[PDB]
Each structure stands twice: as structure tokens, then as C-alpha cells.
């Protein structure tokens, strides 16, 4: 499942 810290600017909210 996608890494939320791969790009912190992407907030999965």
C-alpha cells in the first residue's frame, strides 16, 4: 500500500 512519506505534500486525507 502506498507510502504516505514518499511525498509528504500528498495528503491522502
Amino acid at each position, epitope marked *: *500500500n*502506498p*507510502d504516505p*512519506n*514518499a*511525498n*509528504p*505534500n*500528498v*495528503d*491522502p*486525507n
Partner: antibody
Amino acid sequence: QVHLVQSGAEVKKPGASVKVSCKASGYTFTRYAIHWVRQAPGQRLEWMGWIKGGNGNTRYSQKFQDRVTITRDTSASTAYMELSSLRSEDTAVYYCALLTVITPDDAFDIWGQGTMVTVSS
Amino acid sequence: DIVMTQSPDSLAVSLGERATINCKSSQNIFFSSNNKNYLAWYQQKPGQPPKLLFYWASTRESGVPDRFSGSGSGTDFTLTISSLQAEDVAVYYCHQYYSSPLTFGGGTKVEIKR
């Protein structure tokens, strides 16, 4: 207007280091993370690492971990990136960027104008 | 590590015609929870920083012309320019933000055909 201006070009010899600045403005600097992406001449974009503006947490690419160092100066709202042990193959335009800032509401994406780093003897 | 392969390396299509850039990811970059592909399409003209055209594969960044189209899901993606202008002559990069390291495609050189 959110602007990322970054330092002028640098010419270094192999084995030297370079520190490339990224001054942020037009937004609240401690909120978002600045990424560092380099692009060799005629080559694809290569992501190097990011740092959170207020926290200072870093994540490096595995290709550069041992030479790269991204830092924060909340006082100056500026991001720095230090690539050590330079190599001719590090000759590239180095970008700092607020990559794909996707917040619940509006989305935006902003890059610095480019720092041409030339590594040669 | 997630390899982004773009096809073709270079296409030449005439003014007002259709341009299709293909992009394939080494790994499926679709999150089933939020139903979103973690893909990004960038446009870069010579000597300038890249410009985000599409995020979430299809969601269009504010200010991008409606002739640009982002499509695809999972591993196969497509950037479509319905009627090419001379302003669209650039290198187009697909970009995944699904896992680290963030990777970009090799780029696709779009040129005017005459």
C-alpha cells in the same frame, strides 16, 4: 504568489561538494516539504530527497543517501541541499520543488528556476 | 525502483492533430481505499522547470487547457493532446508518487510535424 528562487550556477571539480539554496516565499514555509530533483543534460528527472519545512525530517533517495544532505533554516525560510563527493555524472540542473501539493481543497505544484551544476576537471 | 517507461521516446504530430503519450509503471500504483492512481503528468519546455499538468492521473491542474487529457489506471497511463498547438511542443514526463523513491518516466519529446 508562491515563489521558489534558488541559487546561481556552480562549477565544481570532482571530489568537491556543492550546497544549493532554495529560498521559499509566498506561503507559510513550515507547512510544506521541499523536494530536490536533478536532471542531467538530455536525461530524465531524478528525485533526490525532500525535507519538511518546519520539522526537519528528511528522506533521501538510495542512490544519494551517502553524499546528499538536505537541511532547513526556518529563520531564513530557505532549503539547502549538499551533494558531496561530486562526479562528472552529477552534472545536472538541480531543482527544488513543492512537488504535487495535494491538500483536501486546491492543488498546486511549484519548482525553482534551476541550478546548473557542472562537475568537471 | 518503480520504473516509469514512456512510449514513444519522441513523436511528431502535425498542428491541430492528436497526440498520445503512453506511460507504463513497473508496479500497480492504484490505492483501492481512495480509488486513485498516484500518477502525475509533467510538461517541460527547454530551459524551464517542469509544469504539473495532471495529478491523480486524470485530475487536471488549474489552468491546464481542456485539450490535454489524462487517462489510464493501475500500470498503464496515457496523456492525450486532442488538438496540438505549437505551445504544446515540449517533453512530457509521467511521475509516480506511490512509493519512494519518486520516479519519472524517460520523457516523451513532442514535436511539430510538417
